[PDB]
Amino acid sequence: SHAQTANWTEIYPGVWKATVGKPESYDLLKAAGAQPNKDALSKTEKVSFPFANGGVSLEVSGGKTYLRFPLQKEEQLYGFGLNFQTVHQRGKILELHVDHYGGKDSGRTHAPTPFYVSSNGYGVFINSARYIKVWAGTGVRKDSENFPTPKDRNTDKTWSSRPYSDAVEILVPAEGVEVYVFGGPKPIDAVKRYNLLNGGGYLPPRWGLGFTQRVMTRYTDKDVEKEVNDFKEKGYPLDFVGLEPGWQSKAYPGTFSWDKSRYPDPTSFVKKMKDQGIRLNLWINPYISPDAPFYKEIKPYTGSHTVWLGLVPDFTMAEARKPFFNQLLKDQIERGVSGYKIDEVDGYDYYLWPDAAKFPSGLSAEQMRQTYGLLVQRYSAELYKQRNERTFGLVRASNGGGTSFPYVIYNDYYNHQDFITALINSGFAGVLWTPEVRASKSGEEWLRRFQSNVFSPMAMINAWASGTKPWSYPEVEADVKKFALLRMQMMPYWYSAFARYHFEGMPPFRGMGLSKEIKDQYMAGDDLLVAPMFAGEKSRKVVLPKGKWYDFYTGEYAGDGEVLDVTPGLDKIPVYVRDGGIVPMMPALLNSPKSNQKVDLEIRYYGNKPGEFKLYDDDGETFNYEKGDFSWRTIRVEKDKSGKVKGSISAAVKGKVNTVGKVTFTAMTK
Amino acid sequence: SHAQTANWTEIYPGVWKATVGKPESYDLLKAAGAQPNKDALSKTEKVSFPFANGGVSLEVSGGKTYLRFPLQKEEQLYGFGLNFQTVHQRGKILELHVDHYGGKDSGRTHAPTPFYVSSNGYGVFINSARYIKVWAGTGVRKDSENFPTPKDRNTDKTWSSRPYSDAVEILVPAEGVEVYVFGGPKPIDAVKRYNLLNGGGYLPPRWGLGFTQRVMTRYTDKDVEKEVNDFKEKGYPLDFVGLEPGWQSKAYPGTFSWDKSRYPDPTSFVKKMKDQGIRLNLWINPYISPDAPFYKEIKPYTGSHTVWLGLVPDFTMAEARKPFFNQLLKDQIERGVSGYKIDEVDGYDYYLWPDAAKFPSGLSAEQMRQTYGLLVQRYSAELYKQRNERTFGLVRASNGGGTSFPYVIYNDYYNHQDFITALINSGFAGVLWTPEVRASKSGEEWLRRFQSNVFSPMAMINAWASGTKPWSYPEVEADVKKFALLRMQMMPYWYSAFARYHFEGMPPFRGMGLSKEIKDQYMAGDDLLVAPMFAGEKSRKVVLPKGKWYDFYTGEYAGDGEVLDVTPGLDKIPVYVRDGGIVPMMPALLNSPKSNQKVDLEIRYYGNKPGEFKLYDDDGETFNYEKGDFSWRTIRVEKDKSGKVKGSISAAVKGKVNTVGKVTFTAMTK
Ligand SMILES: C[C@@H]1O[C@H](O)[C@@H](O)[C@H](O)[C@@H]1O
Numbered sequence A, B: 001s002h003a004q005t006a007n008w009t010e011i012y013p014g015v016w017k018a019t020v021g022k023p024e025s026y027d028l029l030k031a032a033g034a035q036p037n038k039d040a041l042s043k044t045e046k047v048s049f050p051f052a053n054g055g056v057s058l059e060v061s062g063g064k065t066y067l068r069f070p071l072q073k074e075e076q077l078y079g080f081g082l083n084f085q086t087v088h089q090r091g092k093i094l095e096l097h098v099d100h101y102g103g104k105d106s107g108r109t110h111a112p113t114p115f116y117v118s119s120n121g122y123g124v125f126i127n128s129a130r131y132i133k134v135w136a137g138t139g140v141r142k143d144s145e146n147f148p149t150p151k152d153r154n155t156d157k158t159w160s161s162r163p164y165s166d167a168v169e170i171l172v173p174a175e176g177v178e179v180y181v182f183g184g185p186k187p188i189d190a191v192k193r194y195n196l197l198n199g200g201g202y203l204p205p206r207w208g209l210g211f212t213q214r215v216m217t218r219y220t221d222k223d224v225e226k227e228v229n230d231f232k233e234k235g236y237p238l239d240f241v242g243l244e245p246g247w248q249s250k251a252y253p254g255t256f257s258w259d260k261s262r263y264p265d266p267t268s269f270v271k272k273m274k275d276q277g278i279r280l281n282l283w284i285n286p287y288i289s290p291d292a293p294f295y296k297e298i299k300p301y302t303g304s305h306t307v308w309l310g311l312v313p314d315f316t317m318a319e320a321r322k323p324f325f326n327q328l329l330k331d332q333i334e335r336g337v338s339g340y341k342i343d344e345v346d347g348y349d350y351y352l353w354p355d356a357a358k359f360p361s362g363l364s365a366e367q368m369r370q371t372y373g374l375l376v377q378r379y380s381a382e383l384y385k386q387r388n389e390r391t392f393g394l395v396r397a398s399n400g401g402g403t404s405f406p407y408v409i410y411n412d413y414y415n416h417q418d419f420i421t422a423l424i425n426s427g428f429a430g431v432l433w434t435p436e437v438r439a440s441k442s443g444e445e446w447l448r449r450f451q452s453n454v455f456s457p458m459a460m461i462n463a464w465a466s467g468t469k470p471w472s473y474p475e476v477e478a479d480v481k482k483f484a485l486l487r488m489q490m491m492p493y494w495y496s497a498f499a500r501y502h503f504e505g506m507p508p509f510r511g512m513g514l515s516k517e518i519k520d521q522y523m524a525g526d527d528l529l530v531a532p533m534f535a536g537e538k539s540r541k542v543v544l545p546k547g548k549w550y551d552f553y554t555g556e557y558a559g560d561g562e563v564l565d566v567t568p569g570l571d572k573i574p575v576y577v578r579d580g581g582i583v584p585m586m587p588a589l590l591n592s593p594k595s596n597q598k599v600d601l602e603i604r605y606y607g608n609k610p611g612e613f614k615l616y617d618d619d620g621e622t623f624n625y626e627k628g629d630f631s632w633r634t635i636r637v638e639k640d641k642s643g644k645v646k647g648s649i650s651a652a653v654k655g656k657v658n659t660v661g662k663v664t665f666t667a668m669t670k
């Protein structure tokens, strides 16, 4: 080691920054244009520097930046991006490249966030848009304090093929790097500070938390109108419809212009849908057809290589952004289109541009690959913010720096177990992930997928190919409908969780904690432990943290710091509520409520510990909250001496939006 | 593209060298110390430069070297190292890292040779010890002459997810690189010139082509003596025994010193074996125990990181080489030890040193990883050459630059089909590979593996764990013995093929050619097409090239430019002989013949085309051949008017070694 003396500047409470060597002029935070939530960070506890006892070794050598952070024997690690099959990361080796998930945890994935969290209550972010390699406690150094005694494999039964390693080591292919370290005291505190450095989560519109149906590629405007009428007639919720590539006059590559045959009058169509409460979310990939109206203008500002024969705009250049985003604005957003699904900004390598490609800005194709999703998210979101309108959409790649964007990750993979593991890991990765529903061999699988999906960032069927609707499997149709309605009833719960994401950096879906690895349970909001069932299973084990827990459906005591064997039936996803936990429920509305609408709330209170819930309220759709037009309404509930429920809600704040109607309290635990 | 003007110097007939940017001072040829066989290269045809019509674009940008070589529509590509599941490489993307094979063709493998060959009759070698990425015809450039017309996926059934790509693109993480281009006119001509640039193949000792048994880790000197006596008593051939880690006083990490309890008198033991015709091949990994006698001396010249708690010598430093190789020389080689099995110089990444490791020479851990196998091969081989004694051994990693080393690659993987595919690909990779035999669930599998194994560079059972011997499966014991004896009978055939490898660069095992991919047939020498059977199969298809072919066993016409369906039985591996093909057979000796021994030959002549075979002859064991003490004896055979065989052999050369005894001729095709 020739560890270079790097000064750790405490830049916010519990956030330290170090500059090793000569960092590059482009990086993840710069690509994203991520601004820290200074106010939120200033309210966090000043905590001590996590690496109090030395062991940090950062240096530049041979054109690369070498990092080493110490580990203690007790420590487990989480993060290093959107893994699908692993949650404990100590002992893993990962190569953090943006790619479509390939079926194993190599580090190559949709959001290969270079951030990790320790069970000892700290985190570390490497701010590079390069491909980086991580050895998360596999290296064993001859000069280590903790060098294990060499053993003779010939004779010693305790010989180990993976001897004890006492450090995270990272190699960055650059002449320097910025490193951020986040204090605790708890693992979740580190994640929160990381997310706040990124600007906090996006505050979604309420409509983004409703149900979305993506329809078949072939659908015309009339086909969409019919589908909407079918949802209404069947009494299923719907807030936004996803149009797939058929809305464009050409796709792969794209014109970013409405097809004249299928959408002959886009202005009328979008308005008609909006009038029925239905927003539209449009599929794009960013790859340009010679028939796009801005093709000639943008061509010089595109890369050397194409993706499905489409030009690749260099979105680091104003000269590429202006034509591209102008077309979205004038042709779609100004007609009322609510947002986008940004597809195919991930991989595979055989589709996207090679790293040997060249871009007109001079940015490496590598850094472009690592940030392309960030860039499209960034500049598309800005179009909406400029109009004082929230958006909420989908994206197939993100990275560090992307916490604040109004996009949820999805993919073309489908293993349900792994979809839940990704949901867990999204909480460690500063991104949102939806385990989307598409098809299923069976009603049972359809319902199981639907159940976990309504306990996620976005409630969605993607029927681009399958043409399925929530009711397409008659055997589970009644229960699908109940869960679709439950998603709406729970809107005030999800909205308050997302508000915590924005204001405090609290991921709304996260792993347990926050000894053994748990890859199939997650916290959803602060109060709910979700333990999905998978098709073919009649029962599962649920590991409950210490403290009492209550059945979400019945309110009955479930357990306390123990393992349950649960046989929920097909009609229930196992969900448990913390003692004193509160779930505010609005009515089973088919459409998200408007800013000028009051909604009655039933406060479902579980257990016997006095409960406290902070209900977020604002207009649900603009950026007026940035000017202070929002409120947190404190709800408190307990049972009195008689065992009867007693509840309060703090008074509405003068001058602020108030969508809270009549409030009733229900003690779920009899 | 800012293609830099690189001058292609024709450095040998059909070999051109280009220097792009500022190449690094360490590279594959330098690591290997590979000297071209100038004489052999000077005898090859002057052919035209393969890229006659332009399309080459080489440049340095952003600290990296970008290469592009054009492709034509007709072209298929082979090589890019030791692939196990793919032979056609056009359309593949590979990351060429030394690693233990991981179960799919990622580019990470035991010998990730950065050399490819085209069906148009040329080859390209990238001389870098860095990790390089290859896009072997996947990139589609907007300014390409051959840019496919964009299609609308919405409406056009002929839309392609993988549009036509017209170039091989490569990215090297360095400020320059040397590139070598090899002419044809045939694909095999390019491979030959590449191999000759590397110095040709090693000329193995005859004993290296005999049978080797590796025995269980636990075996003592007495256990080895017994095993040898068992082979003799059962009449099975044996030339060298492999000792596994138990020969060392400690292993993982190693002392490189004979265990006092199991090998109390190594001098006597090695001599005793040698006196019975038995050579010894010793297992090592290069990782140093604190009990190695040279530990203190070598310690400063070892890397920062350990492998199974052993120090990693920096073999680019004389100060590390001297102690390490001195110990091998004085403690083993000078006692009579014939060679080594150099294990665990490949991977996985979780065992070997991270790329974040630092080495005392200042060489990157990356370049060390890419060349470690080359270095151990190089310096171990030199110990033997210094003593005018050939060696032949095993190694688990190699690379470009390694053609000339006396080592055969093996691994811990075991899929039999893939073992044959690797054998095919070894011919494109400038390395030797053996599909070794270890265990098997069934007699059938054991025999099938044994059959393909005796048609490979090294006939070997590796029984380190299984304790198996050739006769361990009673149901196939008779047939195993027949194939073991056949390996010996065929020694003059294999030896002449290996002589062509050394003198002409001709790989002794190679793929077909040299439309559809053939991953399960290979040429073995010039005359034999081998088509292995796999356990569970009663029949297979065999694709015969144009020209007549004859059954190896019966001599009967098999076919001509056609597909056969063959049901060989368990007792035969399908082998076909070209028309006029000749297989010289010596007697079924149990031990390779000595330099002063004449051996009778039966010349097995197949078909009816007049045949010509060049039989190589020399002492079979020293480097005297370098001083001209060798001969090629031309054998010619045909049938006369009566259908009776007529043969000749050229006269022995005055003053040269002559091991040829009585020569008889047999026309196999009645
Ligand atoms: C040997 C190397 O020292 C450097 O300073 C560290 O940053 C690397 O991770 C590694 O431990």
Ligand SMILES: C[C@@H]1O[C@H](O)[C@@H](O)[C@H](O)[C@@H]1O
Pocket (backbone or CB within 6 Å): A093, A094, A095, A104, A105, A106, A107, B102, B348, B349, B350
């Ligand atoms: C599964 C893991 O993927 C990572 O990218 C690799 O670096 C490791 O060697 C391993 O193969």
Ligand SMILES: C[C@@H]1O[C@H](O)[C@@H](O)[C@H](O)[C@@H]1O
Pocket (backbone or CB within 6 Å): A161, B344, B412
């Ligand atoms: C842990 C593994 O054990 C196996 O037996 C060995 O063959 C590998 O090289 C590695 O050491």
Ligand SMILES: C[C@@H]1O[C@H](O)[C@@H](O)[C@H](O)[C@@H]1O
Pocket (backbone or CB within 6 Å): A304, A356, A357, A358, B001, B002, B003, B057, B058, B059, B066, B067, B068, B168, B169, B170
């Ligand atoms: C656009 C780039 O131009 C460079 O000169 C080439 O070497 C790369 O492979 C790529 O085609």
Ligand SMILES: C[C@@H]1O[C@H](O)[C@@H](O)[C@H](O)[C@@H]1O
Pocket (backbone or CB within 6 Å): A102, A348, A349, A350, B093, B094, B095, B104, B105, B106, B107
């Ligand atoms: C199988 C292939 O392995 C290569 O190393 C990768 O670069 C490709 O993207 C692909 O996954």
Ligand SMILES: C[C@@H]1O[C@H](O)[C@@H](O)[C@H](O)[C@@H]1O
Pocket (backbone or CB within 6 Å): A344, A412, B161
């Ligand atoms: C060729 C593949 O087809 C699929 O339908 C798409 O979802 C992928 O992104 C890709 O375009």
